[PDB]
């Protein structure tokens, strides 16, 4: 059913928490979004100070893989770090 034409795009959001180490979030940003350290740190800080930030905007499938991978990587490392998606 439905239609055609452009795909819907999705924002990948990182949410702030009080317990995930900053160093860890930086690592996530390099590892899963190809940020260098400089940009990664600034983005971590945007999250830290603003409570949430957009890490990237992607097609639905790419976005979901990022989110799934980010959250799995956080839990496996015993951090509550939450990554979520938003339709752009």
């Amino acid at each position: 059913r439905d239609a055609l034409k452009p795909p819907s795009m999705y924002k990948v959001i990182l949410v702030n928490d009080d317990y995930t180490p900053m160093e860890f979030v930086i690592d996530v940003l390099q590892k899963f979004f190809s940020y260098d350290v400089e940009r990664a740190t600034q983005l971590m800080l945007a999250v830290h100070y603003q409570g949430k930030a957009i890490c990237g905007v992607f097609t639905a499938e790419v976005a979901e893989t990022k989110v799934a991978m980010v959250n799995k990587y956080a839990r496996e490392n015993e951090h509550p770090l939450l990554c979520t998606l938003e339709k752009a």
Partner: peptide
Amino acid sequence: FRSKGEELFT
């Protein structure tokens, strides 16, 4: 997030 004093180069 939580810092551990590194820190931070940005």
